[PDB]
Every structure is written in structure tokens, then in C-alpha cells.
Write an enzyme that holds these catalytic residues in place. Structure first.
Site, PDB file in Angstrom:
ATOM      1  N   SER A 141       0.820  -1.217   0.000  1.00 40.07           N
ATOM      2  CA  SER A 141       0.000   0.000   0.000  1.00 40.07           C
ATOM      3  C   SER A 141       0.861   1.278   0.000  1.00 40.07           C
ATOM      4  O   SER A 141       1.608   1.519  -0.951  1.00 40.07           O
ATOM      5  CB  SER A 141      -0.993  -0.025   1.170  1.00 40.07           C
ATOM      6  OG  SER A 141      -2.064   0.880   0.970  1.00 40.07           O
ATOM      7  N   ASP A 212      -9.807  -5.420  -4.272  1.00 38.02           N
ATOM      8  CA  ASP A 212      -9.221  -4.480  -3.325  1.00 38.02           C
ATOM      9  C   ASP A 212     -10.061  -3.208  -3.347  1.00 38.02           C
ATOM     10  O   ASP A 212     -10.130  -2.527  -4.370  1.00 38.02           O
ATOM     11  CB  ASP A 212      -7.779  -4.188  -3.755  1.00 38.02           C
ATOM     12  CG  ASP A 212      -7.014  -3.316  -2.772  1.00 38.02           C
ATOM     13  OD1 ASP A 212      -7.611  -2.438  -2.113  1.00 38.02           O
ATOM     14  OD2 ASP A 212      -5.782  -3.502  -2.681  1.00 38.02           O
ATOM     15  N   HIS A 246      -7.158  -6.272  -0.014  1.00 39.82           N
ATOM     16  CA  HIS A 246      -6.017  -5.457   0.410  1.00 39.82           C
ATOM     17  C   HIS A 246      -5.310  -6.050   1.639  1.00 39.82           C
ATOM     18  O   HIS A 246      -4.279  -5.534   2.075  1.00 39.82           O
ATOM     19  CB  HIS A 246      -6.521  -4.041   0.725  1.00 39.82           C
ATOM     20  CG  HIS A 246      -5.459  -2.985   0.741  1.00 39.82           C
ATOM     21  ND1 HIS A 246      -4.868  -2.500  -0.407  1.00 39.82           N
ATOM     22  CD2 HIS A 246      -4.922  -2.280   1.766  1.00 39.82           C
ATOM     23  CE1 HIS A 246      -3.996  -1.561  -0.088  1.00 39.82           C
ATOM     24  NE2 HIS A 246      -4.010  -1.407   1.223  1.00 39.82           N
TER      25      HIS A 246
HETATM   26 CA   LIG Z   1     -10.144  -4.612   0.492  1.00 42.14          CA
END
Ligand SMILES: [Ca+2]
Ligand SMILES: [Ca+2]
Ligand SMILES: [Ca+2]
Ligand SMILES: [Mg+2]
Lengths: 268, 275
Positions: A141, A212, A246
Site C-alpha cells: 500500500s 481491493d 487489500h
Molecule cells: Ca479490500
């Protein structure tokens, strides 16, 4: 410089440790995790740095990613610093995106770019059985963004780079705009992977979950980065992973591929 | 771009341009020589106190640049007209004295980004505006600019085809000029300093072999003062197996009279790798 050991736990033959030190760049006590694989018992190892994303300390990656088996087998020292000198102030992330801040009050203490690229490796090299000549970087990220920009701003400094769900074009997404606005106040492009790759003078692996939420929200913008790579003829492997999100469950699924990737370019 | 001057010299045109710098947040001047051919690009970095005028007027580089069809770019040595407290006082710091670093310390953070200017912004601007091959670029310089040329090449493996220097500051972490500049611009964290020191950088340089040419006047006051420390760099190269030709030139000083004497050798050296 002097370290304080916080914890040590054996894992796949090596030792997962956490340390505290006095950071010169950050003006505070900073924690980082270090995994010493079996190789580190007898010899110097190549080093792989992991940068974490939002709401993470060092603990998340070391306890939830399942990176140890492959790091142990290939003999990589893995370093995972904390994400920031201070806790979160949180409508934005409140995070500083691994920049050297130019705005007060972040100015004085938020020097994460210099910490990651200069101070931390100096400390690791002085204290652990690590080969200073072989270093790679990866992350998730905001930390995926971090890894990319650290590699792209310092050609040849890292043998390889990879990322999970990186923020690829922060100058164009809400998270990046809000973070850069706070921490940097035109200065922004120097910390944007899509901009940086366009003038890069080399082996990149990226995994992205298709389910995500932050991809769907437009925070990540991977296609902008891939297009910039393609134009520059930079070899990138971008994998869109169906139904993955994610979370660290996604990271854990593909972490072995990443460790293998880095092991290759670190000549491990 | 705004053209400031244009003068014909050995068939080509010596120009000076002004632009608004993004990295340095100020108006900057730089010189560009367009040979009759205009091409590969060769960047010259100047030393302490210089503007974009010193090298173009005093080096006599044009004949060789013309004959070898090289575009030559000579930038200024610091941001200009910023009126920052502390920058105008001393000849060895601030204006005319950027040291080709990206400063991390206030009040230098915003304007003193000569490293990013020389390696990123300037080549982007040149490529976009001039008939330059973006894939064929080399760099050289004098003193602070010799330091600059060496660190720019060593920090960017694959970016430059060749590098050379005249009386370079080779181990700035150890000399008075470097210690002052680095303390001011980068602060007390010397890990930062080492990343801008040619002697440290060559030990960790992972790129393809560079064939480095260095000329040094033996009667150079700054050599005698210990500002330059070339032997440290030569030894560092030897151990990394980076080929280096180091030429100690009897009775030569630090001046452009020295530079002018050997400039043709350097242009030919870069031409070998650029053409
Ligand atoms: Ca997610
Ligand atoms: Ca030519
Ligand atoms: Ca500077
Ligand atoms: Mg980015």
C-alpha cells in the site's frame, strides 16, 4: 550504534527480533523488526527491507505475512521498520507516505525517506551480519509506494523492488493529495512512482488484488505506472489477482513469490 | 525557455537560456552549445563561485565539441535570487556553492536541490527543447563540479556513458569545504554525507565499468590545502577495478588556464563513448 532488543522468537530456524534505537533522522526512539535467517549464524546475508502501510507497526508484517519460511530457505535478512515516528492523528489517512516532510510541524521529525534510505541501512550494516552491497526493498500500500520511490530515486541502490497493492500515482489520488498537501505543502512529483519511472536510467514485481476496495476507489492507479514502465521499456511483471483484497491474507498468498524474486536479484 | 544570448563559435552556436526551475524554485540561467551537427549531450559542472559564464568563456572547449558533434550544457552552480538568510555571506557556501546535493536542512531544503536539478530537471528540459539524444549523455566538471560529475555518475549507474574531472573534490566528507557544506545542507547525520562522496560511492558502485579521466595540477593550492584528496579516490577505484587515468600535471594550478590546456583531451575522451 546501540540497540535495545525488545523481543526474540525462533521461526523457521532463524530468529525474529524487534529492536529500539535513537533515530537521528526522526529525533525519537524508533522500532524495527529484524529476521536473522539460519545463514546469519555463520555468514553475512543480503538484506530485504519491508515497508508497511496504514495502521501498521512493525508487528503486522512479522506476525501475519508468513514470509519466514522463504526468507529462511533463501537466507535473507528481512528488516521491517515502523511506519512513522509518532502515532496517527486520525477524510484522509493522516500518514506521511515515506517522504522527507517540508512543512512544519512534520518538518522537524517526519524524515522517513532519509530514515529508510540512509540511516536505517547504516544501522543495520553496523549491527547485523548483513552484506552492505546487496539490498532490496518491498512493501504494501503506502509502503508499496515507499518501496517503488526508494528504488526509483536511487538507481542501482536496490537490486530489486516489489510491491503489494502499491499507491502508484499519489499526485492524482485523494490519499496522496491529502498526504502530500500536509507534509510537502510541485515538490510532489519527486515522490511519485509514475513520474519517477519516466526518467529512470530494473526488475519490478507487483501483485494487486482485483477485489481491493482501495483499487476500486481509485487510490492505487496501477495502470498509470504500468503504462509509464511500458513506454520506458522497463521490465515490470504486474499480476492482477482475481477476488483478492487489500489484507494480509492476500499478502501471505503471494509473499513466497516475492521473496523468490528478491533472492534471485540478491544472488541468494 | 528565454534566450539570453547567441554567439557563433567554431560553426556552432553558443547560447545562454533562462528558465523557471521547478526543483530550485527560482529563475536559472544555463549555457548550451549547439555544434554544427545539432547529438549526444555532455554536461559540464562548474566549481565554487562560478556562474554559467566561466567555462564557456574561458575553457576554449568549443573547437573539440564542434569537431566531435557534441551538445554541451553548462548550468549554474546554485539557485539564484532567492535572498535566503545565510546564502550570500561566504564564497564557499550558499550562492555559487550548491555542492550538487539535495539539501535536507532548513533553510536550504526548498531551493538547494542542485543534485535533482542536474540529474533530473535539466536533462528533461534539454531533451524536450534541443536536438539531443536522451540515451547518450556524459558528465564532467571542475573542483566542486568535479565532485558533482563523479557523484552524478556513481549514483546513477547506466545514466552516463563516461565521466571525467579537473581537480575534483574526491573525498568531501574529510575536507574542510565538504565538512562545512555537508554540515550546513545535510546536517549532522553523516550517512547522508557518504551518499554524496565519490570515494565512498565508488566502493559500492554496481554499474558497468566507467573509464574515468582525472587531471590535477600539481601546484594547485587547494590540492596542497587538502581539499581534493584524489589519492583516496584512486585507491577506492583500484579496489573496485574501476579503470582510472589520473594525471598529475607539473606546475599547473586550479585555474581555467589549467582547464583550457587539457579540455581537448577530455572532449575526445567523452566523444569516444558518446559517438
Ligand atoms: Ca479490500
Ligand atoms: Ca556526434
Ligand atoms: Ca544544492
Ligand atoms: Mg508512488
Amino acid at each position: 550504534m546501540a540497540l535495545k532488543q525488545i523481543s526474540s522468537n525462533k521461526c523457521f530456524g532463524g530468529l525474529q527480533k524487534v529492536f529500539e534505537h535513537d533515530s537521528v533522522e526522526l529525533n525519537c526512539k524508533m522500532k524495527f523488526a529484524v529476521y536473522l535467517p539460519p545463514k546469519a549464524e555463520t555468514g553475512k546475508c543480503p538484506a530485504l527491507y519491508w515497508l508497511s502501510g496504514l495502521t501498521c507497526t512493525e508487528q503486522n508484517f512479522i506476525s501475519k505475512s508468513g514470509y519466514h519460511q522463504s526468507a529462511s530457505e533463501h537466507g535473507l535478512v528481512v528488516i521491517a521498520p515502523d511506519t512513522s515516528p509518532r502515532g496517527c492523528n486520525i477524510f484522509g489517512t493522516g500518514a506521511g507516505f515515506y517522504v522527507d516532510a517540508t512543512e512544519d510541524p512534520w518538518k522537524t521529525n517526519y524524515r522517513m525517506y532519509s530514515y529508510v534510505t540512509e540511516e536505517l541501512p547504516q544501522l543495520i550494516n553496523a549491527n547485523f551480519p548483513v552484506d552492505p552491497q546487496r539490498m532490496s526493498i518491498f512493501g504494501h500500500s503506502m509502503g508499496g509506494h515507499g518501496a517503488l520511490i526508494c528504488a526509483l530515486k536511487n538507481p542501482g541502490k536496490y537490486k530489486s523492488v516489489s510491491a503489494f497493492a502499491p499507491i502508484c500515482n499519489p499526485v492524482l489520488c485523494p490519499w496522496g493529495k491529502k498526504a502530500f498537501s500536509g507534509y510537502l505543502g510541485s515538490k510532489w512529483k519527486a515522490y511519485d512512482a509514475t513520474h519517477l519511472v519516466k526518467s529512470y536510467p530494473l526488475d519490478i514485481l507487483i501483485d494487486q488484488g482485483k477485489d481491493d476496495q482501495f483499487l476500486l476507489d481509485g487510490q492505487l492507479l496501477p495502470d498509470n505506472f504500468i503504462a509509464a514502465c511500458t513506454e520506458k521499456k522497463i521490465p515490470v511483471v504486474f499480476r492482477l489477482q482475481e477476488d483478492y483484497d487489500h489484507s494480509y491474507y492476500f499478502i501471505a498468498t503471494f509473499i513466497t513469490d516475492h521473496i523468490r524474486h528478491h533472492a534471485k536479484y540478491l544472488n541468494a
